[PDB]
Design a protein around this nucleic acid. Structure first.
Length: 71
RNA sequence: AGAUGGUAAGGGCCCACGGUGGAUGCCUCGGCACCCGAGCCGAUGAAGGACGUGGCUACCUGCGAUAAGCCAGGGGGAGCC
């Protein structure tokens, strides 16, 4: 886990503003998919959710530090 | 024609062992006093709240749709959620 996290950030940090936004929408959707499965029981292994959640935060956190200078 | 003995439905006093009840002693994440230190917050939206937030979550706690958490700098070193 930790290893990947730092990488996410490196690549994301240089990803443009317009391109980020769409990466997020996409991620957001994956989340929905994951809750639906959670609800039915049938396939669903916990850590997967809080993970995907913290992703979006980071993604959005980055989107803002950009906005503070670039639009 | 004569006599003090003898029964316990129940009751009383004493002794032994239990029941109820929570005094006593010992104990203390709490309180009280004094002395020091420190002393404002808010339209860049306070103090105080409401609702919400966990894979499963009644309440408390922490957070706010990025929701028991997001970024970086410093401290620490084997255990965490």
């Amino acid at each position: 886990k930790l290893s990947e996290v730092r990488k996410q950030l490196e690549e994301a940090r240089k990803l443009s503003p317009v391109e980020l936004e769409k990466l997020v929408r996409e991620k957001k959707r994956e989340l929905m998919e994951l809750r639906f499965q959670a609800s039915i029981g049938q396939l669903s292994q916990n850590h997967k959710i809080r993970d995907l959640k913290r992703q979006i935060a980071r993604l959005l956190t980055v989107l803002n530090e950009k906005r503070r200078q670039n639009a």
